[PDB]
Amino acid sequence: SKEEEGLRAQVRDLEEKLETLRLKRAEDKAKLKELEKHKIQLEQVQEWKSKMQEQQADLQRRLKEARKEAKEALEAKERYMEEMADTADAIEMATLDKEMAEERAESLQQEVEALKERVDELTTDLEILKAEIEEKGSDGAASSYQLKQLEEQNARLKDALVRMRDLSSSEKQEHVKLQKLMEKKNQELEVVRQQRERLQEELSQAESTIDELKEQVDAALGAEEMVEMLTDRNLNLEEKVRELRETVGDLEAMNEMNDELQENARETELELREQLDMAGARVREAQKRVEAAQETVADYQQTIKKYRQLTAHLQDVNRELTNQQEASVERQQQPPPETFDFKIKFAETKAHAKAIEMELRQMEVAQANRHMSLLTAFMPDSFLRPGGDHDCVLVLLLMPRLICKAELIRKQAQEKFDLSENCSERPGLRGAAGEQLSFAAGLVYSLSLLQATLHRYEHALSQCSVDVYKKVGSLYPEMSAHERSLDFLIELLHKDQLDETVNVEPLTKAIKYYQHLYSIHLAEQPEDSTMQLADHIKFTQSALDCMSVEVGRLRAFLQGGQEASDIALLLRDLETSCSDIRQFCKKIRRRMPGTDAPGIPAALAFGAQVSDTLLDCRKHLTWVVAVLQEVAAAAAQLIAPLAENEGLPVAALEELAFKASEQIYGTPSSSPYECLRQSCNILISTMNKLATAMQEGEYDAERPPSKPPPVELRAAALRAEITDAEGLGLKLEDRETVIKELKKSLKIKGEELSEANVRLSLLEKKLDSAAKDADERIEKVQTRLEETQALLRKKEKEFEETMDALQADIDQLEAEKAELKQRLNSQSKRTIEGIRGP
Amino acid sequence: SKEEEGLRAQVRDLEEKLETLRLKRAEDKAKLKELEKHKIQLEQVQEWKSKMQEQQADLQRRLKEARKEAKEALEAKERYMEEMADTADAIEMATLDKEMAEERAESLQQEVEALKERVDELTTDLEILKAEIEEKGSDGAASSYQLKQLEEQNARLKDALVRMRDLSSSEKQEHVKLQKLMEKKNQELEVVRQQRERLQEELSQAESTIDELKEQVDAALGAEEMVEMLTDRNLNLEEKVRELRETVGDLEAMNEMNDELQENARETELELREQLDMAGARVREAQKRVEAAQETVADYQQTIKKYRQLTAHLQDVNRELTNQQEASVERQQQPPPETFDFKIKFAETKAHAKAIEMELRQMEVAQANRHMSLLTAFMPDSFLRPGGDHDCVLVLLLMPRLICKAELIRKQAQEKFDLSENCSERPGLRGAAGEQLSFAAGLVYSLSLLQATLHRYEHALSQCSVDVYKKVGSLYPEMSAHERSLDFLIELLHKDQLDETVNVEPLTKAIKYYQHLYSIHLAEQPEDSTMQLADHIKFTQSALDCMSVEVGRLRAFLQGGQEASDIALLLRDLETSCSDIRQFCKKIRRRMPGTDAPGIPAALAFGAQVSDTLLDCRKHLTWVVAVLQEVAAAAAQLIAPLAENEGLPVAALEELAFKASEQIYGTPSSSPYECLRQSCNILISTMNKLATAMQEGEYDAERPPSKPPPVELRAAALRAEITDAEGLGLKLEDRETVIKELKKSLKIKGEELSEANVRLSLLEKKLDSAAKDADERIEKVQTRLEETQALLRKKEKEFEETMDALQADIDQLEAEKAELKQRLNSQSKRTIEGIRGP
């Protein structure tokens, strides 16, 4: 199927999605781990972020402070440069003035020193005196000439003195400037050394600060480590809280179903509890129905006691009125029981016994149906096919069943409507009571007709041929369909709804059908005279009941004062005829077979003319009943609008009788009076003759039981057909076995032939080659004998040479021994014969 | 198709799995959203952190500079107010130096004036000396002093030259030592400046390190704030995990009651439904009593109709006898005719239907009997023969019939004797009431056992083989004989004569019969687990009823005041064991198959171990019931002569209990106390285990496949053969022709084989004769050969013996020759030595 392939594709698709989304949840949990890492990092960057915000603010504030304090230091320094300007400008006058004063003093001092040198220079300027001096002579003046040369050398030296004095002054000035620059440099060196020591202290402070900050970072790393291990714990707990929340939701959902389920169970327990409150009242109210039917069984039993005491007392009063043969008249042969009482227990016992009986009967019915099914399983389809032997059996059952149903309806209808011989005198025949009685009588009449027809069927099928039996059986469906009119009537009786409003169309149709079918297929079957006559009596009695009821109704329809009218006389005559025919029926019934009383024959037999007379009697009875019923129906329609004290005119009833008689008898212009009178006269004469013949024993006969019924003949044929083919199967099995054994025997004994036949060939050849082989072992053995004899002769000469050689050796040895003895003697003799010279 | 439904179920399962892990995925992806904005704003706060670290670094730079600058501005102001002081001093003593230099210049001015006066004086004196020497001309002795002054001045001037040359060189020595003190101090200042610069660089590096460490400290101060964030969160989450786990536990716990309460509600519901089914069994029993009292009203109403017809007939006879005696007229009065005119009419409207139903059922029974007689007529003789298929069908019918009769009797007996669960507390258990209850309980127990056995029979025969079916059918007369034990009991119930005096041996004895016949012919047929369990429950309940009744009777038999004895509280223990086992039976019955209620399986299936356990349970039940019944019977006819106020001693009841316990349990010297208690413990344990396994569905199964009953196959076969048996005849004709041909072929090569065998025997006559002739001309030859061979061998020892003798005979001769030779040699030597004279 294509749908299977589509479902398989969707299964694979869903399985693949389940792989992918499981793998994705695994990835997606790992990715949640990345969430929690990012959360730690975000809290770290946020904490550093806020701390950073005031760190930046604090650095800005410190920068504000440091720059403000630097600017204030600069402002102080600047107002203070102003004070510098004042004092320094005052200095540079004062040094200008001191410097002019010092330069003036130094100029005056150099002029003082040059003037002292000029005083000495003038003492040497006495050198000028040379000119006056050497012009005078030679002793003192010319001596002063050399004096003056020395004096000029002096003047020469003095100038160099002055020059180096000036140079020394310059050097002194430079000296002072140098040493007081040096004082400045010492101050600078001291300041720089102090600044170096301050920088060393500040470096030591910063450097201790680095160490202390490292220590603080270590403690705060303890805090970070504290954070990380707190966070690991916290993430585990978050996962667990989340999972527990989900589980809590699931459990809440289960608990909520369980709460409806308990509520529904509680509602059902409440419903069962007032169902038990119902049912205790139902057991009490069915038990009140039980004590009520047990009070009805009570009162039925107190009234079977009251009818038992009443029947006992009426029997004792009757037996007292009969024991009255003598004056005594005083004997009640029964002790009075009381009321319900022992009878109570009798009926509770009988109800218990009847309950047991009904359970047993239900069990029997179920058993019969089961046995029925099991048996049906065993006989073949040819039996069960439509129109087969089963349908014929069903027909044989159908007629007794139909007869029984018709009898049940007839008896119940007679009892319910109190159909009695005196129905014509019942009050209220003009109204609904008359219609009810007419309906009941007609129903009983129709049922009697049906029963007679079915009795004919039963007899004919008990004695017909097998062919007719099968033909009737083939009609079983159609002629079983008509039972279901009678079933309708029985259902109406069961519901107490059988009344004059009931439609009897189907029953009449069924009767006509059965009569017609009998006329077609069973017409020349013989009839049973005994219960042909019994059925005739029953039919006649039912027809007479109908006739009497209709006569009474028609009399009630007549207007008062018309009793001397011609129709009223006819009605009275019909009533008298009814009584007479009923008396004849009773007379015939007394001699009817069935009881082992003296004078009653075992059976009846009469000729075909008696049967024809009975048919004619039935036809006339049917005509009279039909006429009366039609007239009464029309008259009832006419009388309905009339008052109770008003009646119909004889003219109207006469017209109705004219019409009905013409329609039913078929004879135009025949008076209904003398049609009906003729029919009744024929009936009276016929029953009178029949009653006389019966009383005289003219019809007495010995009783003709049916030959083996066609069903038994057919069953014997079917069993024979089954058997001498059922045994054929066993025969076939045996012939199977025989055939297998036989052809097995064929190969076995054929290949026994083949073996024997090879053996023939072999030992024919063996006989021939046995002649051959006998010859050739004879030659073998006889060659062997020759060879052995040849050895014997061989060995015999060899023996003989060996004998001869050994004997020669023995002879030679004996001769040699004798020769040695001779030689011994001869040597001894030669010794003494050699000494004697010749 | 099966596969489409399986695929749809798998699709549904896949879909639910995807939806569950999609919802877990969805929670996870909400958390992933949480991640994914956490990552966005981690990058945002990280850009922010890095950017503002840049800004902080710039601020740190600026603040370093500003501290630098404030320090330098303060130092400049301080040096500069040092300079204010220095400048004020310079002003003051520049003014003072101006005044000193002024009077110094004035003093030198006075000196200049005096020296210019002396220069004028010397010029005048030189002019005077000029005039004097111009006057003198001739001169003497005045040229000496000036000469001396002029060497002394040449020397003085050269010495003063050298003198303040030395002074200039000393000033330059001081000035050079000074200047090199400059240069050393400037180098010292340069070195201190270099040290200061290096210190300042190192301090700058240290300050950078300090700022970075301070910032680390900042981040980790934030970390401390997380430490206490996370600590609080972690405590709260631990508490929340604990609370969520507790809520999970609470929800699980009242889910657990909700399940238990649902089970208790179902149990109470079924007890209410058992009470509703005994209210409805009282409705069905009060019905069958209303139906029984209504067909009893129908029979009594037919009886009052017969009594009414008889009383009307007797009243008509008495009234014609009263025709001459009395006739009534009566004034106005309204006593209705007969106490039940419309009471009988109402019971007629109602159970007139019941009378009709009785008649219809009777004719249905007659029709069924006739129908199955007619059908039997068509059945072959092989079917109807003793041991045939008919007997097998009759077995299949007999044994459901037996079951139905069986609890008809059980069901009536329970009602009649009011066998209830509380029979142990009924008054009068010591007397006839106890005996009646014991009889009723035992009867119900036996009937339950019989029903269980027959149920096994029904199940086995529905599924056995045809062969087993056939021998079981062959035993039909024998098992059908046992039915009228039950028929006798139904007699007794119908007559209300079923009491404790009834002999139940035929029933027990039929039960034992059926128990073999099953053990022999149906032993390895499979059992129906469901209705095995159902029968076990029913049997156990009946046994418990017997059990309780006997316990109550034994308690009633005990002496007053012996309630504390071992036997009395053993009896109490047995009573509680009964109650517990009954509760387990109810539990099991609740989930038992048979109703279309949810949770009830279609069928039950359990292994052979469970079946064996059930058998053991039944065995122990039987033992305990038998012991109690035997003890109670013996005690009852020990207590009969005792007064109502007197009781049995515990010694007597114990001694009876010991006797019964041995000869039922078969174990000598075992205390009845352990035996009974152990049996009850086994029952309770097993029965509780079964209830539990039943309650969690361990035995649930579908109904097994229906497979054709042996009767069906047989029936089919029987009917089948009937059909094919037509064609079998044609086959038999063919097989017969084959057999005739096979036999003919067998005969021909039958006497071909015989002919070959004869020829074989004849030809190997020929060989044997030919062989014999050959053999005894052959024998004749090797007789000669054997004789020659024997001669050759014989004639060969004779040579060997002889020629050994010849060898010895030569060999003696050589010895004699040797002796003569050494005699000859001795004589020869004497001849030679005698020939040389000495």
Numbering used by the authors:
A (entry chain B), B (entry chain A): 214 to 1051
Which lines from the publication concern this structure?
Previous work showed CC1A and CC1B fold back on each other in isolated dynactin. We used AlphaFold2 together with previously published cryo-EM maps and crosslinking data to generate a model of the autoinhibited form of p150. We find that the ICD is docked onto CC1B in this model but is detached and connected to it by only a flexible linker in the open p150. In the inhibited p150 the ICD blocks dynein motor binding to CC1B, showing an unanticipated role for the ICD in p150 autoinhibition. The model further shows that the previously identified hairpin, formed by CC1A binding to CC1B, is incompatible with LIS1-N binding. In contrast, the DIC-N binding sites are partially accessible. Comparison of the two p150 states suggests that DIC-N binding destabilizes the autoinhibited p150 as one DIC-N copy partially clashes with the ICD whereas the other would displace CC1A. This implies DIC-N binding opens up CC1A/B to allow CC1B to bind LIS1 and the dynein motor. Comparison of p150’s inhibited and open conformations shows dynactin autoinhibition involves the previously identified CC1A/B hairpin and an additional interaction involving p150’s ICD domain. Both CC1A and ICD need to detach for CC1B to bind dynein’s motor and LIS1.
Cytoplasmic dynein is a microtubule motor vital for cellular organization and division. It functions as a ~4 MDa complex containing its cofactor dynactin and a cargo-specific coiled-coil adaptor. The formation of dynein-dynactin-adaptor (DDA) complexes is a key regulatory step in dynein activation. Here, we determine the cryo-electron microscopy structure of dynein-dynactin on microtubules with LIS1 and the lysosomal adaptor JIP3.
